[PDB]
Structure formats: structure tokens, C-alpha cells
């Protein structure tokens, strides 16, 4: 019937003065555009069909053509920035916002989907969708006593579009829009569907990626305990965004990191720092590094949870990026920690893996490791352990690596290695 039409026949049908022929041609276009194998988006655009689809969006007495045109425009807007721009130039944003209030659930869902693609293009189209007033009807669609009564796919699409309205930076979403959206986000964050939870955590991670004031906007709503709970979840698509959000939060002030700590997040890190997924380990070590850069009582809480041995393990064996994050965490620990805490760090066996990592070509990790060693040597000086630590470094082959670093391109590597040799190895 409407299967495998040529764009020529689609154009012929849409250009006819017969609403039913137009509907048939629009469904044929939808079926062309809904195939995985290279949907002919550019051919549909060149045929000048976008204005006709946008006009069909507003045919209230023919809901099927509304639905078909909405689906076609959704799939067109799902492509490159230029194709999304072609959709937007046709005036589709206000038409989709108007359709959000359609009495037909599938049409409003398709409008949500299209607006999600448009906003997900980037900052400019996101803020334009916002300026057209989509947030109010979007949130109204979710204003029900129990989210469970809503259709699953409908709720998932709503959550995804909202997350896209929270996404992207330079600029970040408007403050008032974020405040308007956040309560519904908090509610979605307690929903039971895995996809809704994952997309809500992704939205929260978007919103926490910025100045401490944005992190505060999010943290004030009291979502950190729920974020930790989800950090403990079994579904990787949930743990990943929850961990990203927690990391972004701990990049803020020490009080926000303390809010993360009080929720019990550290107890989850024995598994996260041994998670078989590389990215989970990497981001968990990055979070730990941003935690060890905090106050001394927070370093002490890291110690009490037995996470220093796990940092040693990650530093000993892990993907190289995770090892970079571990080196950064150790350097922050040693720069901000007490003498007792640095001595404990040494007692857990950090020296040997820290030295083994000095043979890597990455110059910045070498600088980081040398800074950590300098801090440890200061802590030892304060106790008179300088010689004992020097002997330990000699026994594991670290002295050879430092002596080799003396003749290194980077000025700071040069100078720091030479200074270590001159000050602690006579």
C-alpha cells in the first residue's frame, strides 16, 4: 500500500488537493524515513516536503496525518544539525508544542520525541525550544499522582526529552528553566523503570557539570542519597550516569563532597574500583581523586572505608587512564593529607606501583607522580623517615627511573627529578 514509494510519488500525493491522498503519501514518507538502512532524509528535504509536513501537524480534524507528519519530522530532525535546522526553519517547534496537548496519546508522544531531537541538537535549538514554551506542557504531561499509570514508552520519551532540555553547555540551560524542571526530575529519579532512571541520572549529570552554583541547585533538592542508591544498582546503564553525577558533585565545594560522603557513597567504591568495566573504574578513581583533594577529615573518611588499598590496587594494575586518575588521587591525598595519613599511604604499598608508573611516556603523569613523591618525602622529613623511604625507593627500582628522568624534555620533570636526587639521595 504505502510501502516502498518513490519520493516522486510521495511528492505527487502530497501536492494533490486530496487530504486522503496527502495522508497516504505522508505515511509512505514516514515508512521511507523509518528504515535503519540509510533513510532518504536529504532527498525528502530537497523535495520541499518539510513545509507540507509542518502544515499537516496542525490538521486537527485528521489526526492520522498529524501523527504521520510528526513521525516523519521526528526522523528528519534525528539526523545531522543541518537536517534538524531544516525541520526548525519550517516552523515545527511551535506546531509540536501545540500538539503536546493533543487528546491522542501517540501524537503527543511523537511531538515529545521530535522536540527531544530538536533540543538535543545543541544549545541554540535547546534554548529556542525553551523560548517557545515547551517546558510547561511537557511537565504538565507528567503531573499525575502516580507515574506508574503512564505508558512505559511514553514516560521514557518524556524523560529523555527532558534530559535533552538539561543537556549541553556554552551556555548551560537557563537557570529558571532548570529550576522549573528539577522537581519533576527528582520525582522521575525515584521511578522504578530502568530507562527512566538512567535518563534521569543523565539529566542530573548534565546539570551538575558546571560551576558550584549549578551543583548547588541540584544538591539542594536532596537527590544525593538517591544518586548513591542508584550507584549501588545492578544495571550498568544506571550506574554509569549515577557515578558521573556523583563525580560532578564532588568536583564542587567540600561541603557538597561532604553531602556525598554522608549519603554513604564511599561504601560502594570497593566494588566500583574493581568493576570489570573500564569506564566505571576510571570514573570511580576520578571521583576518588576529587574526594582526596578535600579536607583532612574527608581524607580520613576515605581511609576509614579501607579505600587506600583499592587505590593502590588500581595504581598497580588497571587501564592506563584509570592509572592516571589513581596517580592524581594519590597526589591530591599527599598534598592535602596529614603526616599520619601520608605515612599510612606509604604503609599500604603505594611506593612500588607509583615508581613503576614513572616509566610511562605521558609527561603530565610523571609530573604528578614526582609531586606526590615530594609530598611523601616532606611527610617523612617531619618524622625523620627520609632515609628509610629513600631505601625503599632504591629497592624497587625507583631511583633508576628518577635518575633517568633527570634528562627529560619537560623543564618541570627535569628540575623536580634533579631536586629529588639532590635532596634525598646522597
Amino acid at each position: 500500500g504505502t510501502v516502498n514509494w518513490s519520493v516522486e510519488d510521495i511528492v505527487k500525493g502530497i501536492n494533490s488537493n486530496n487530504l486522503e491522498s496527502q495522508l497516504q503519501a505522508t505515511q509512505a514518507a514516514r515508512k521511507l524515513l523509518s528504515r535503519e538502512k540509510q533513510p532518504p532524509i536529504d532527498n525528502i528535504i530537497r523535495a520541499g516536503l518539510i513545509p507540507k509536513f509542518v502544515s499537516f501537524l496542525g490538521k486537527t480534524d485528521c489526526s492520522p496525518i498529524q501523527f504521520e507528519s510528526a513521525w516523519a519530522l521526528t526522523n528528519i530532525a534525528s539526523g545531522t544539525s543541518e537536517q534538524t535546522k531544516a525541520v526548525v526553519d519550517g516552523g515545527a517547534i511551535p506546531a509540536f508544542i501545540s500538539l503536546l496537548a493533543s487528546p491522542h496519546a501517540h501524537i503527543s508522544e511523537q511531538a515529545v520525541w521530535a522536540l527531544g531531537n530538536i533540543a538535543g541538537d545543541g544549545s541554540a535549538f535547546r534554548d529556542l525550544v525553551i523560548k517557545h514554551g515547551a517546558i510547561d506542557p511537557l511537565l504538565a504531561l507528567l503531573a499525575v499522582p502516580d507515574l506508574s499509570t503512564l505508558a512505559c514508552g511514553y514516560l521514557r520519551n518524556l524523560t529523555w526529552t527532558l534530559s535533552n532540555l538539561c543537556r549541553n553547555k556554552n551556555p548551560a540551560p537557563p537557570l529558571d528553566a532548570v529550576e522549573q524542571i528539577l522537581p519533576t526530575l527528582v520525582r522521575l529519579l525515584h521511578h522504578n523503570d530502568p530507562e527512566v532512571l538512567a535518563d534521569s541520572c543523565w539529566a542530573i549529570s548534565y546539570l551538575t557539570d558546571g560551576p558550584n552554583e549549578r551543583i548547588e541547585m541540584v544538591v539542594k533538592k536532596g537527590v544525593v542519597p538517591q544518586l548513591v542508591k542508584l550507584l549501588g544498582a545492578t544495571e550498568l546503564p544506571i550506574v554509569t550516569p549515577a557515578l558521573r553525577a556523583i563525580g560532578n558533585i564532588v568536583t564542587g565545594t567540600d561541603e557538597q563532597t561532604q553531602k556525598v560522603i554522608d549519603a554513604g557513597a564511599l561504601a560502594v567504591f570497593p566494588s566500583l574500583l574493581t568493576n570489570p568495566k573500564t569506564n566505571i573504574q576510571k570514573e570511580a578513581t576520578w571521583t576518588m581523586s576529587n574526594i582526596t583533594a578535600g579536607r583532612q577529615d574527608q581524607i580520613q573518611q576515605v581511609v576509614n572505608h579501607g579505600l587506600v588499598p583499592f587505590l593502590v590496587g588500581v595504581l598497580s594494575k588497571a587501564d592506563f587512564k584509570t592509572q592516571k586518575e589513581a596517580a592524581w588521587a594519590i597526589t591530591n591525598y599527599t598534598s592535602g593529607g596529614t603526616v599520619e595519613q601520608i605515612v599510612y599511604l606509604v604503609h599500604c604499598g603505594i611506593i612500588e606501583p607509583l615508581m613503576n608508573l614513572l616509566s610511562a611516556k605521558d609527561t603530565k603523569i610523571i609530573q604528578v607522580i614526582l609531586d606526590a613523591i615530594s609530598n611523601i618525602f616532606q611527610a617523612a622529613e617531619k618524622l625523620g623517615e627520609t632515609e628509610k623511604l629513600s631505601i625503599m625507593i632504591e629497592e624497587c627500582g625507583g631511583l633508576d627511573k628518577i635518575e633517568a628522568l633527570q634528562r627529560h624534555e619537560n623543564e618541570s620533570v627535569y628540575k623536580a627529578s634533579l631536586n629529588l636526587i639532590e635532596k634525598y639521595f646522597s
Binding site: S34, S78, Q110, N117, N164
Partner: peptide
């Protein structure tokens, strides 16, 4: 990050 956009496929 996850997909910015997604088409409705059938």
C-alpha cells in the same frame, strides 16, 4: 555521553 538524537524505527 549517550545519543543526542534518535529516530523512530519500525
Amino acid at each position: 555521553y549517550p545519543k543526542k538524537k534518535k529516530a523512530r524505527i519500525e
